[PDB]
Nucleic acid binder design. Structure first.
Lengths: 293, 295
DNA sequence: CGCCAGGGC
DNA sequence: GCCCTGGCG
């Protein structure tokens, strides 16, 4: 047998051993699609195309594996001795009567995985976009003044702490629902000047756009989605717009002299990130460039 | 042979047909447990107990029914002609292999319903608590003010005129990071203070303190306060909240309204009686308030 | 401690 | 258009 509690604990063991991390999957997909071979202008000019292709292919490289995983987990429930000499129809009926909780719990675990993974994959996709564009960023998940809702800080947290002038903060939510309300909260709490909110959401309202606007949160989506749903609306930006802004601001940072301590802190920031991303050559390379400059 | 989209359509049709609404279930449970006969002092004094008993009993009814529903939905995909000559073991194995999107879509639909229902039911339980306590409230789902405010004491008309001596209540069964929505709404509309009712046992001192600076006060059961937040004068119990509501409500007891405000209030109440037309206890609560405008 | 490949109400 | 009987990462 296997109690629902015991099944839940098992579900977790297997998921870990069977699935590579969201960042690992994104990185694999980045390299498989040959994005590690494109120059910086590709990322600057085609971020929507890149995001859409990444999303497409990450899902392709996940979905068949989630399907197999589910079937494996359910196999632990099948009880040969209980069902032996049952009619095949009665065996399935029994299974749908005896285990609809275990079954529900497996699927619940899967959706919860999917939600967390979708967000982390989306953030990873955007992170590699900035790295491919050659734009200096600290990844908050790789190292108050900055809430955890902010994923990317350009050009880094040390510089931002020094002065928020000429910096860019980016948050991401795949869909918004009412969860966009979290963002103005973080903006107001820490005195953030403005924040970019990257999304794939095709359904948010003019009311939402305006409330975010008043709060100095700028919604950024793919050019496809803007043109299809928000074409006229100058308060909705595209990734193309955001990348051009990021690039412009970044240039203000490519010839700066730092104090002993500041340079020390920045080095320590980048060091932390080389450590986190040790196993990913393209990313370690990105940071190394920043460190020797 | 049901396609995944067809199965989704059936699941939605069947769910609508067979499950009563969150409020209807709460109202049934309220009456089944005898709360519809308790005086206001009962609710004033025993809110935490009432809330937990309501939650337990709502779930006791719902969960067996949902289990039976799930089994019934799944039986629409059993294919006799397909499975005729397989062993029972191979039959199940095949089932686990042929319908993964179907089974997942059903469970997904179930948890999404559970999430939506859990919030609506908690809100309904708190609504009936205030009604039982005899405290005047407008229910935002029944008639500026953020859409996450559930109850407005004594009413939206009065609140709009002047928020002095009013009370606003929001509710979230669990907080996660979603508590961040509350300061956003407080700050957007200039809310003086908001009570945030929750059953969550796990929120941090940092969250408490950020909410505190935002003039949002977390309200939870006695049990949760004493187990996890015993020392902490920033975390209130439902008992504390009800005492505050009752004290503020007395300021609204014999208020003389202009004819204009009186007719707007009347409109707001009459609107809510419409929403709750099917629920005698709630209609009677509102008609007492309507009657008070002519007293 | 944040995410929401998120449908339900 | 807000809910999260919500676990995963």
């Amino acid at each position: 047998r296997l109690s629902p509690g015991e099944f839940k604990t098992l579900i977790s063991k297997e998921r870990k051993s069977h699935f590579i991390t969201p960042f690992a999957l994104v990185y694999k997909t980045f390299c498989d699609l040959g994005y590690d071979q494109k120059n910086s202008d590709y990322f600057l000019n085609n971020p929507s195309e890149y995001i859409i292709a990444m999303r497409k292919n990450c899902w392709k490289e996940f979905e068949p594996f989630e399907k197999e995983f589910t079937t494996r987990m359910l196999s632990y429930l099948i009880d040969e001795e209980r069902i032996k000499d049952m009619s095949p129809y009665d065996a399935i009926r029994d299974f749908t009567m005896e285990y609809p909780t275990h079954i529900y719990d497996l699927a619940l675990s899967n959706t919860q995985s999917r939600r967390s993974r979708a967000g982390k994959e989306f953030e990873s996709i955007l992170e590699l976009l900035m790295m491919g564009a050659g734009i200096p960023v600290d990844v908050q998940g790789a190292i108050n003044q900055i809430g955890k809702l902010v994923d990317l800080v350009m050009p880094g947290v040390v510089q931002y702490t020094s002065n928020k002038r000429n910096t860019m903060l980016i948050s991401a939510k795949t869909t918004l629902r009412e969860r966009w309300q979290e963002v103005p909260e973080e903006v107001n709490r820490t005195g953030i000047r403005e924040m970019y909110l990257a999304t794939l959401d095709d359904s948010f309202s003019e009311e939402t756009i305006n409330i975010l606007y008043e709060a100095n949160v700028v919604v950024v989506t793919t050019v496809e989605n803007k043109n299809f749903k928000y074409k006229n609306n100058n308060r909705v930006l595209t990734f193309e717009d955001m990348l051009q802004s990021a690039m412009e601001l970044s240039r203000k940072w490519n010839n700066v002299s730092y104090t002993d301590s500041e340079k020390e802190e920045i080095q320590q920031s980048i060091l932390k990130q080389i450590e986190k991303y040790s196993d990913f050559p393209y990313v370690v390379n990105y940071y190394r460039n920043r460190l020797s400059a």
